Write a protein that binds this ligand. Sequence first.
Ligand SMILES: Nc1ccn([C@H]2C[C@H](O)[C@@H](COP(=O)(O)OP(=O)(O)OP(=O)(O)O)O2)c(=O)n1
Ligand SMILES: [Ca+2]
Ligand SMILES: [Ca+2]
Ligand SMILES: [Ca+2]
Ligand SMILES: [Ca+2]
Length: 901
Amino acid sequence: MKEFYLTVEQIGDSIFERYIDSNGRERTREVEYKPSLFAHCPESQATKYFDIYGKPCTRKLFANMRDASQWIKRMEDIGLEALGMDDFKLAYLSDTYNYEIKYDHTKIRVANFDIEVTSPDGFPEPSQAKHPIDAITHYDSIDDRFYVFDLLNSPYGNVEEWSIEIAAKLQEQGGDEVPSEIIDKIIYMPFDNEKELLMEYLNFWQQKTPVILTGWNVESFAIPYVYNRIKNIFGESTAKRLSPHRKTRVKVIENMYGSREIITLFGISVLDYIDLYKKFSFTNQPSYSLDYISEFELNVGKLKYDGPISKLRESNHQRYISYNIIAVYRVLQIDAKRQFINLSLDMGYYAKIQIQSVFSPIKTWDAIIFNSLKEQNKVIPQGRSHPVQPYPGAFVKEPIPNRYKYVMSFDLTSLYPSIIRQVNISPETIAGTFKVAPLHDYINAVAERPSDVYSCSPNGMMYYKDRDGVVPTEITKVFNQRKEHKGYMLAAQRNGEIIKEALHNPNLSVDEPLDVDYRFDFSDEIKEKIKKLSAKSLNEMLFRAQRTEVAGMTAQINRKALINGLAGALGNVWFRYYDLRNATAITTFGQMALQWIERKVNEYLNEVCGTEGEAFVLYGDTDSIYVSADKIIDKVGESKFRDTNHWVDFLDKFARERMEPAIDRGFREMCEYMNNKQHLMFMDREAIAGPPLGSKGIGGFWTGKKRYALNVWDMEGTRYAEPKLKIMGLETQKSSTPKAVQKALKECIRRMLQEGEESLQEYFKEFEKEFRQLNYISIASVSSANNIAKYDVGGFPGPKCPFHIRGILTYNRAIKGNIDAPQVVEGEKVYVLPLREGNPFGDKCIAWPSGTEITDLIKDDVLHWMDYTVLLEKTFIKPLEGFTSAAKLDYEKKASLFDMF
DNA sequence: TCGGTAAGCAGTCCGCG
DNA sequence: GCGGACTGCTTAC
Ligand SMILES: Nc1ccn([C@H]2C[C@H](O)[C@@H](COP(=O)(O)OP(=O)(O)OP(=O)(O)O)O2)c(=O)n1
Ligand SMILES: [Ca+2]
Ligand SMILES: [Ca+2]
Ligand SMILES: [Ca+2]
Ligand SMILES: [Ca+2]
């Protein structure tokens, strides 16, 4: 097989590399890598190396990496550019793996671990590590085994061995319900003392050294705790055995309001799953506890135990250990679904970076562009310092707040990357500038044509047309990968709908789910077999189709995020290719494109309808337009349609056969106007929305920019078994909105769009009547909580204290002196409830850590004093009033003359 | 929360005769 | 009470 790296590090003048050799074996080597950098040289001097602007360079080969770094410093002292890859390990990888990396995940040791630490005096601080580590569960992907290290004797209690037999039993038999599929994969090791546990753990680590190390909060808790605990018991040299090169560094992670420490383990790639999830999931969750995320992702119940976690080991060591094992498995289950590790490996190896660098789009693109340029013996520029400067972004149309009955949306494919490719925007393709007119003048095609030679953006920039820039070349590659995965995602989505349809008529039989590839549209034969399947088999197929769709979503959305990240990196001062001329060339072209096509779409539809000056485009945001289709439907007449699916088909055909060609003609003209390199503005129909045929539903409404709701029948070619609400921006979509209130507001919206005003009024009256019975957690608001200290003046709110921070201060006073009470963690999320006048907490609200029950010490009092009236007004009535006033509807029945009978 | 801009709403403070 | 200046937070792209 072709070799591939696992990890790479620079330690002084050596590169330390772990890799898989040509026989599939893991190896380690230390290489005295001699880096090269570059200086500009005279034109009359033969070289094969040129900078990106075509200026010749001489290569400087250094005796060692320290010499190279010192040279960079002296070049700064002199005032001359030091060119080339200054991150020497990326240069090493580029020299050592000068081909597209083919990696084999089965050879990569991926470790998932979790530790338990009993602590009587609150949260066990990793930098102190003053409490024994009393359990470690460490799953190894190569062995496919859960290694359980269990401390039986501690100063906080002596316990009996954990029983795998009890662990396997149902909770109803007094068991822990450790899933049967992992029972035979557990290797259980009890220890008489913590010193022996840790020594054995280190020997095990040495034998089975993680390449990728993950788990939940491992980077912020488990790793620093284990490192510091071993350091405290045994000394530094022993703790450094967690690094295969025996090198570690305390790394200070700074943010706006403070800092924290992590431990860098040289020769390991730490991908904390909480951070993978935050980056790649595209969710914003009210809590990031593993129990909360597990329930969200997997629909598994919370891990149930009695009493505080600080007393769990002593009271129920059996459950304590079982829950540590289950916690490790939950992360593997989330990964089996989401496939974030797979994604990270794919992107890291593609870019030729340390796998952990996938967190940095700047590092990722720097490496991609570097490797690309190096292929042509081109030399990258030195990074420079720049002041942070604001720059303009997208255009968003102000909508007229209203109901909108029939709506068709259109959207540009991968807009910013398409602009980069169309215009040819790159550091080395800048050709010059032209005299800019107001943007309105380009939108309306009255400005002078910018150039007859170069490709232009309405910000004034011109670009070469003779050859593709490196940024367009490399962005196109990732764009093409993204397109492939999005195809698989949409097919799985369409396949899911076929199964949902068939589930209306399940057959009474015993059978099996069909063996199919859900990434490809089902054939006629498959469709025929599906129509004969039982509900059991159909539901199993639906689950599998949906898992396929999720895997496709992960692969496609994050490749989209990467290419959009390159457009944004051009506006980040730390990017080697930072240039506000290029960043603004993209965003300004985007503003023009949207408003240009708004004009063209209005012109086309006014022509087909035989009107002038009427506004068909009701809204647009960045790259999408929303078109009122009422007049199109009305030209046919609602009476002429058999059912909802009939007018949806008609609009689908109208959009594909009439509107899309008009839109294409409009953009081809714009391409010629800007003299662009290649026409790539591809705007396709996105959604078809409207009320069910014959109903009183309103179809859709807008309240303002980035705030609307539509009843969608077809989305990007997926014809839904049942209409789907597309709600953007409204409170139903906000993590700050209470869970039960999101649900209620969504149903109000469903009723508005699908059934009408009377149905909405019926539901509102019931909710208002019953909501006080809702569980307190389900009606609590949620907020991130920053700067608790800033607003804390003797335990009371300082000037301008935010509402949620006020709540935290109330909580802090209520739990004062109690060492065991859960503390609110700066920067994390809290639940917030309003409190009625004259409550014993002395303030108008209280807040406590999100994802948790409020402590038993004050729970009773919180429940008794919760202000349900304020809660309802603020989270439910106020947003609903906004929806209904926009839609010109009443949520309560107005008096009429009939009341007189 | 270590890792592009536009723009919405909640809440504080305080004016507005 | 409602709006502007401002902070804080959270979305849509
Ligand atoms: N984090 C983000 C999200 C979006 N955008 C910009 C660039 C996108 O091209 C544009 C429109 O975003 P969309 O969500 O409509 O997605 P794209 O058009 O990029 O992709 P798709 O092909 O899915 O429509 O907004 C951005 O700069 N950064
Ligand atoms: Ca735990
Ligand atoms: Ca788009
Ligand atoms: Ca059937
Ligand atoms: Ca869009």
